[PDB]
Design a protein around this nucleic acid. Structure first.
Ligand SMILES: NC[C@@H]1O[C@H](O[C@H]2[C@@H](O)[C@H](O[C@@H]3[C@@H](O)[C@H](N)C[C@H](N)[C@H]3O[C@H]3O[C@H](CO)[C@@H](O)[C@H](O)[C@H]3N)O[C@@H]2CO)[C@H](N)[C@@H](O)[C@@H]1O
Ligand SMILES: [K+]
Ligand SMILES: [K+]
Ligand SMILES: [K+]
Ligand SMILES: [K+]
Ligand SMILES: [K+]
Ligand SMILES: [K+]
Ligand SMILES: [K+]
Ligand SMILES: [K+]
Ligand SMILES: [Mg+2]
Ligand SMILES: [Mg+2]
Ligand SMILES: [Mg+2]
Ligand SMILES: [Mg+2]
Ligand SMILES: [Mg+2]
Ligand SMILES: [Mg+2]
Ligand SMILES: [Mg+2]
Ligand SMILES: [Mg+2]
Ligand SMILES: [Mg+2]
Ligand SMILES: [Mg+2]
Ligand SMILES: [Mg+2]
Ligand SMILES: [Mg+2]
Ligand SMILES: [Mg+2]
Ligand SMILES: [Mg+2]
Ligand SMILES: [Mg+2]
Ligand SMILES: [Mg+2]
Ligand SMILES: [Mg+2]
Ligand SMILES: [Mg+2]
Ligand SMILES: [Mg+2]
Ligand SMILES: [Mg+2]
Ligand SMILES: [Mg+2]
Ligand SMILES: [Mg+2]
Ligand SMILES: [Mg+2]
Ligand SMILES: [Mg+2]
Ligand SMILES: [Mg+2]
Ligand SMILES: [Mg+2]
Ligand SMILES: [Mg+2]
Ligand SMILES: [Mg+2]
Ligand SMILES: [Mg+2]
Ligand SMILES: [Mg+2]
Ligand code: NA
Ligand code: NA
Ligand code: NA
Ligand SMILES: [Zn+2]
Lengths: 121, 50, 160, 152, 81
RNA sequence: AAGUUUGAAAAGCACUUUGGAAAGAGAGUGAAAUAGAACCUGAAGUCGUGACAAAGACAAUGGAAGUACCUCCAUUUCAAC
RNA sequence: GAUGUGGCCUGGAGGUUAGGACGAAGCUUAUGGCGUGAGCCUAAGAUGGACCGGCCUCUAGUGCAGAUCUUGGUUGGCGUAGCAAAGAUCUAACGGAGAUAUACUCAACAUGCAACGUUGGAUACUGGAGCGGGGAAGGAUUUCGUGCCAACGGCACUCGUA
RNA sequence: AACGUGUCGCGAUGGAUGACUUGGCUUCCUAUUUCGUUGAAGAACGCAGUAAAGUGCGAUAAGUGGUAUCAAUUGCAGAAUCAUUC
């Protein structure tokens, strides 16, 4: 949302005080090479029920379905990306969306409108 | 176990001072169980508080 | 102008066994009775506070400016001076380096890079690229985060 | 408050410590130091005899203008006291150390104290009121105590 | 004597809460606030204490209506067609 | 007055054992726990501890020369060199 | 007191040349080397975890031992002075982690002390101008019950206007 | 002897230093840019399923409506719809 500018202070303040609707755009992930060719779009904002593969970090290579876009902790929650607590409970591990690649898009009418308007052809 | 509440309630009910209120050294459990003026009056009737 | 002096501070005098420095009035707070108004005092006014009417700019004689530009141009035609300044001009054909005017018709950066490689200015260009780094010190917290060397200067006959 | 020294044999040693004890540092310092080289049972017996006031704790460092007693002669001193608050705290620490030795499978009857360190913990602040409307500090000096013992 | 003993002679209040400003500066006997000069129509404001002025100035409170009217002015009093 | 500035992520220490509790001793998480919680780095001053050096009373410190003992320091040398 | 110093050092800028996850800054030293010196450099960290060095020029809120200097912390004095007006408490039982708490020897004393809340007794005090019962001013939940002992009630608490 | 002294290793106390900076300070610019008896600024009291402060709001009370946006908010809980608008 035109966050970058000549002032590092102003840019960082705008990023970390960005509203939720701006945080959605900031938390975008690249489309897979298959989806990129089909839609002619480079990246999309992640939303719940999208299928992603982790490309960077400890969980690299793990596939799963997005279960939450927390947007307050700048992380997305993936069902297959989790770990164990001390008491044996299973807790999801947050991942920054720019570290994953979207393999399948949860399609909605407005989602299709965004894909159509971002079509570069 | 503290019987301060029962001693205070007995003093008010009997209309006398704490020195005049006698709380049976035995039956402290029964006296401790009285938490209302109705229960304290029963203790007075039974002779546990004189 | 008001920084460090916006207090109703007065000295206690010499009767009390404390230094004769103005001190914050009142009570009930940590700053009550603390030293004030001093360049040595925490929360006090700095020595010789900076002013905006400092002489920031400078006049330079017009002929001296022209002399300096002329001298800089003459030094640019000496390959030993250019190399001493740090440029990689080992493969360039001639100094001064004069190229044809057709480069003004370039529309793609790819063509411009091809021209730079052909006339062997890419060595200086790569020198700048490899020198890009985060600036050391506080300047990176300011708006001067990235530093790099100076590469070649391409001089055009006009703004096109 | 980590241990400043390591036992010679870890599997034959037991460790115990307490932080911010809320006992006087100086009194606890004297109380704990006297058992540094003693067997665990002898240290426990001495503490019981200190509580019985038949034996005393020698005050070697923090003894400025304290009273004199004959019970300090066995330690080579003339000034000693009976700091019951420090003593009962130290006996609790010895019980924890003995429990650790028992848990590791060692025999408490053969455990010899090898390390005793008392440190000045963070101070707690209170105030006292003085003449001419002066307020003046009224400080509490807690201590850190750490020890370990090894099988002999 | 003056001092500690005389401190116990201080009974009652000179000032109570002010209806206009709520600063406990309303002189009971003179029926006027030492802080805001209520019930005089205008408030106290003195340039020898700019700090006092800026404590009480506009923007130190909610600006309940000023926020609304400033938005309307910025939008040129826009209204539906 | 006061930066909650732990960590990449709470994964914020399950469970065992001693203790009335606080906590201790184990065990775990983590690359790191001497990163354990208003927790990055952790100085100075002061203090505790183990080892060692000794030392009468010249208040102590200091200067210049040696010597005794020590030295996770440096450098040189090891064959007709 | 003057002046000089291809004299030393600090933050930032314009240039140039380098370093850093195989460890930057900072910090530590019986780590040595170099310099008459300001200081510089290496070594080690069983320190640290992301920046940063040299050289030319520019620039400034640029070098501390002490101003009864400022702020923060510490510290000997020191377990010291003391915690002494308002007389005074004792006893048993119950309650409580607050015990009757023990290597060997050994019957119990000489090896778990001290201090408590409640009830019943005992002794005494206040002595109606009251450590009696109600109000104003002032305070504003301190009132009541249950739970609770970290901090606070300058000793203590299992008690409390906590 | 013991106190005490000195050194080294390891700990405690104590939060300097470095790195970090959504803050301050200072200098420029843009304009259908200047409150109120049509009750302002300021003050007070309230409003959340859970809510002390702060923020937002005013018994329509952490908000109603409209437009745009296009799958959340998030400590827990609750929740028709999983969505052309409703
Ligand atoms: N050894 C004598 C003293 O050493 C002191 O300095 C010592 C310490 O400051 C310094 O720091 C040591 C470090 O060396 C050693 N390798 C690791 C240790 N963690 C550090 O110690 C530090 O951390 C620990 C806890 O981690 C703290 O307990 C301790 O107070 C702190 N100084 O090691 C130094 C020893 O060489 C003083 N400079 C000085 O008063 C005196 O010379
Ligand atoms: K002065
Ligand atoms: K000050
Ligand atoms: K009026
Ligand atoms: K003023
Ligand atoms: K001097
Ligand atoms: K002292
Ligand atoms: K009442
Ligand atoms: K207390
Ligand atoms: Mg200032
Ligand atoms: Mg730096
Ligand atoms: Mg005396
Ligand atoms: Mg004495
Ligand atoms: Mg006093
Ligand atoms: Mg007074
Ligand atoms: Mg007077
Ligand atoms: Mg009067
Ligand atoms: Mg009057
Ligand atoms: Mg009147
Ligand atoms: Mg560390
Ligand atoms: Mg010797
Ligand atoms: Mg010598
Ligand atoms: Mg500066
Ligand atoms: Mg040293
Ligand atoms: Mg200065
Ligand atoms: Mg200094
Ligand atoms: Mg005394
Ligand atoms: Mg006395
Ligand atoms: Mg007396
Ligand atoms: Mg006295
Ligand atoms: Mg016994
Ligand atoms: Mg007993
Ligand atoms: Mg009498
Ligand atoms: Mg009376
Ligand atoms: Mg009460
Ligand atoms: Mg007390
Ligand atoms: Mg609230
Ligand atoms: Mg209404
Ligand atoms: Mg919608
Ligand atoms: Na990324
Ligand atoms: Na230190
Ligand atoms: Na030491
Ligand atoms: Zn007023």
């Amino acid at each position: 949302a035109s966050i970058k500018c000549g002032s590092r202070r102003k840019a960082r303040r705008a990023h970390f005080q960005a509203p939720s609707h701006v945080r959605r755009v900031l938390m975008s992930a690249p489309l897979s090479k298959e989806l990129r060719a089909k839609y002619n779009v480079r990246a999309m904002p992640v939303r719940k029920d999208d299928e992603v593969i982790v490309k960077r970090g400890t969980f690299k290579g793990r596939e799963g379905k997005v279960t939450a876009c927390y947007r307050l902790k700048w992380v997305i929650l993936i069902d297959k990306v989790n770990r164990e607590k001390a008491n044996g409970s299973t807790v999801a591990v947050g991942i920054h969306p720019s570290n994953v690649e979207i393999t399948k898009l949860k399609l909605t009418h407005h989602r299709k409108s965004i894909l159509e308007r971002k079509d570069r052809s | 176990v503290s019987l301060k509440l029962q001693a205070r309630l007995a003093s008010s009910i009997l209309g006398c001072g704490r020195a005049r209120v006698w709380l049976d050294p035995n039956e402290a459990v029964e006296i401790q169980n009285a938490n209302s003026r109705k229960s304290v009056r029963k203790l007075i009737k039974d002779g546990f508080i004189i | 102008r008001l920084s460090g002096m916006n207090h109703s501070a007065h000295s206690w005098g010499t009767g009390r066994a404390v230094a004769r420095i103005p001190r914050i009035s009142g009570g009930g707070t940590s700053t009550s009775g603390a030293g004030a108004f001093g360049n040595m005092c925490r929360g006090g006014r700095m020595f010789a506070p900076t002013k905006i009417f400092r002489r920031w700019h400078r006049k330079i004689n017009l002929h001296q400016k022209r002399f300096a530009v002329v001298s800089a141009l003459a030094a640019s035609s000496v390959p030993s001076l250019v190399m001493s300044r740090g440029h990689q001009i080992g493969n360039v054909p001639e100094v001064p380096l004069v190229v044809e005017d057709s480069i003004q018709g370039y529309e793609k950066t790819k063509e411009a890079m091809a021209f730079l490689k052909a006339i062997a200015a890419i060595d200086d260009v790569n020198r700048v690229n490899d020198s890009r780094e985060i600036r050391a010190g506080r300047g990176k917290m300011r708006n001067r985060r990235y530093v790099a060397r100076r590469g070649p200067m391409l001089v055009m006959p006009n703004n096109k | 408050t980590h241990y400043s020294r390591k036992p010679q044999v870890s599997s034959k040693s037991a460790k115990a410590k307490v932080s911010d004890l809320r006992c006087h540092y100086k009194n606890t310092f004297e109380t704990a130091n006297v058992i540094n080289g003693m067997p665990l049972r002898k240290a426990q017996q001495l503490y019981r005899q200190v509580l019985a006031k038949t034996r005393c704790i020698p005050f070697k460092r923090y003894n400025g203008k304290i009273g004199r007693t004959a019970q300090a002669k066995e330690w080579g001193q003339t000034k000693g006291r009976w700091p019951r608050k420090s003593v009962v705290a130290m006996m609790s620490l010895l019980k924890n150390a003995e429990a650790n030795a028992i848990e590791k499978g060692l025999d408490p009857n053969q455990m010899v104290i090898k390390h005793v360190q008392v440190d000045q913990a963070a101070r707690m602040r209170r105030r006292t009121y003085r003449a001419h409307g002066r307020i003046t500090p009224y400080m509490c000096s807690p201590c850190h105590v750490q020890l370990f013992m090894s099988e002999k | 004597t003056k001092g500690t003993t005389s401190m116990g002679q201080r009974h009652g209040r000179t000032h109570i809460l002010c209806r206009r400003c709520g600063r406990n500066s309303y002189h009971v006997q003179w029926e006027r606030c030492a802080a805001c000069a209520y019930p005089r129509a205008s408030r106290r404001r003195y340039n020898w204490s700019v700090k006092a002025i800026k404590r009480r100035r506009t923007g130190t409170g909610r600006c309940r209506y000023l926020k609304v009217v400033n938005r309307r002015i910025a939008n040129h009093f826009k209204t539906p067609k």
